[model samples]
Target: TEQEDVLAKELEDVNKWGLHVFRIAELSGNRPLTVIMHTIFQERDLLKTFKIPVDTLITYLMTLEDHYHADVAYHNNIHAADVVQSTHVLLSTPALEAVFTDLEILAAIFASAIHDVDHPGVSNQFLINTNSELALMYNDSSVLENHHLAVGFKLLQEENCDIFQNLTKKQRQSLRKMVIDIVLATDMSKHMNLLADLKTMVETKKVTSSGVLLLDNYSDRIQVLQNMVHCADLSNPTKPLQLYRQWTDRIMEEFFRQGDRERERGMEISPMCDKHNASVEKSQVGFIDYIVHPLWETWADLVHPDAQDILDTLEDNREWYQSTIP
Candidate 1:
């Protein structure tokens, strides 16, 4: 039970922004869903309320974990687990504490876990360009997310694995809709629209006397949680330097593998996909500037000083990458 003990110890600080997911995955035999299961179950007290059997939950996670393409370098189950944890950290920020209902937290955690289920290690653009079945099935509208929801919910419908069996019909419907919306928002194609909404929210943010978020409208609260998932998805650069670097390397490896596939098919190589042509440092710097920085900066603003340390780490990483560019 030493492994279980370590998992318990790790869960103790799971609220910390820099919780080392890599270590948790190691301790759990590379089963990221184990980490995710414990985090959400304990954080939301799902077991006591829902009466979810441990065996049933484990079976469901095994199915979900199997859906992930273990061969993919980045968009695999580990990344999915990392996103769930990151979202937890984001929601736990001092300023945003007590803002989310338990159902909302459930929806968000569920959304993060299955957001990239069965990902093929390539961008949506690749799928569309290749005229893949997923692209056609979705008509190129949030292709991967649609696939994730379809697959995950299908698995959830199985007897004994249906985690939502305890919920009322309305609760199921509401949770389903929220999860779908947030998963769709995770697509990079939706990045601009998502950030635009976040920017507007930051400019017009409202907080209560106790410093908790104040958005009376359901849509506004949903939007904030959607943006929170988006932030967590792009949170690699804001992690501790060691974890950030590990994620960077994994992503780059994934990119290079995709580039190799493109080359085999005589397709044009993506900017970051070409290993020989890629200046990792340069690409990272531009990534932080145009994408990661703006997103995190606004998110930090939304949460104020609670997230400033994340901003500082991002800046530090950006500069570190800048110094490497020749």
Candidate 2:
């Protein structure tokens, strides 16, 4: 089919750091998460390594992608595809080359794909303030992240969707645990603590003579993988400027929608949610300065020259957004 041919062509660029995910979503008929996740599993030979049937993989990925609310502005399937691609690039960086095992690599990619599976386009605080069912269910803690992981893993239990069924009990257990840790770390509430640990890792990082990171323990290894997904989750500003702007627009739209809901419910509006008063450019500038830049800088430090171009792109994007603030 022409669609398959075109999607294959786009998939050729899948391993590129600057691959445009929005284009992939369009090309793949809005199945970007499925296409990217399947391609990545193939690229990494994960299917063969774990004895996963291709049909099962496709079934699982397709079901998983459908769970991402297409109605949500930013935390939909497209964003999941973007983060999966970003996490792939981060894992493949020269400084971290072969630093993670195939199991770890598989877990990281899986975690990224499912990290925001069913996000409600509102912050955790919003959910808590509103006393939503999800907040009550998760006890107002990493509510969305927890739901994402649970729902994501639950999909695997569906008939003909058990992609991980081929793995042994221990392998399945490890993958589940790692995926849980990685997904939970995506919660914004954990950002400061995550970044602090990453900073300390960079300062005391062990490296080979050729400059590759040497993480020997499970604790150290998982910490780095956690930050890798976190960096990927926060990777919008580091992307090419046009793509970054598109993501910003989508996220702001989501935020404003949340604010609209809050207004209807007689609740306080969240920051950056007032569509009339919000300065999108200024918000990007502050986000880049306070959250994105600091985390990416530490990530660049860990990966050194491998992430230099990404860091440069982030800085350029920040300056461009800052310039529009008049």
Candidate 3:
């Protein structure tokens, strides 16, 4: 209870881009997922308006948190918490006021909380090539995304963890669809099309007489949420240098471990997985160039100068990595 209150109060002051999740996790005894999600729910008054049982919501979040592999290099509960915080920050951009409904906000937050549940600590390509049960289960289409959604929603089947119990059937369906779409949009395979959609929107977006952004259509609204969560998922490099470098370290270790698995199985090692030969700086720079930059650039356009500082930090991070490349 003390941790909950402390995190909730701190979350109140977290601005558009100021989440030190590891700090919160440490201070709160490493319960960031439950704390962060509860804070978001309470801040939006969703817990009360939706009539969700607070105990049930906590059970759901903690259960979901337990599903994340704690030993994994990057896809752990901490990373999930980071994305949840990042999504909240992105939603707070001044240019985005009134652009989303409370229901959409709820969906975005929920999607972020469970987007990588039960991750196998490997890539979809790895799963597909290995013909893993997960790849077969989802027919190799967004295998991890499908698994994440399935595992996350499955937790709701428990009576004590059904946070959605109070919603109308239609409301449930809408939230489910929104969550699914946003989670799936985080897949790298969808990046190009997602960015293209956001780029098109930035070129053709509308504003209301009162200066708030207007995404009148459901398609447009969901596209924005998709891009919002996508940006959050990939925002590691845009953080302060210390945090950004830590993420690089974690992901590289994960990648290298996967490479070790591939080697033991006599498969070709994935790019950047060879710890002895890989250049973290070079790979990070390439990732920033071909993926992170374009997406964030379009997002900054959609949110305008609100995101320029983030873009600036991202470019600086890229250059930092560039300079360190051996």
Which number leads on lDDT? 2
RMSD of 3: 1.9
The residue pairs found clashing in candidate 1 are none
> How do the residues 1-326 of candidate 3 rate in per-residue lDDT, one tens digit apiece?
88667666666655547577777877677778888888878877899888999999999999999899988989988899999989998988888886788888899999999999999799999999998999899999999999999999999997699998999999999999999989999999999999888888888888765546788888999999999999999999999888898889999999999999999999999999987789778889999999999989988888887899999999998988898866
Q: lDDT of each structure?
A: 0.86, 0.92, 0.88
The per-residue C-alpha lDDT of model 3 at residue 254 equals: 95
The alpha-carbon RMSD values of the candidates against the true structure, listed in the order shown, are 1.5, 0.9, 1.9
Q: Which model, 1 or 3, shows the larger TM-score?
A: 1
Clashes of 1: 0
User: Top TM-score: which candidate number?
Assistant: 2
What TM-scores do the predictions have?
A: 0.96, 0.98, 0.95
Greater lDDT among 1 and 3 belongs to 3
Which segments of candidate 3 are over 4 A away from where they belong?
1-13, 209-211
lDDT of 1 by residue, 1-326 (tens): 99989877876777788787888888888887766666668677877676767767777888888898888889988898899888988878888888888888889988988888889898888999999999999898888889988998899877678878778899899999999989988888889988898999888888887667788888898899899999999999998889999999999999999999999999999879998888888888899999999999888888887898999999988888788777
Residue 191 of model 1, lDDT score: 92
Candidate no. 3 TM-score: 0.95
lDDT score, candidate 3, position 304: 80
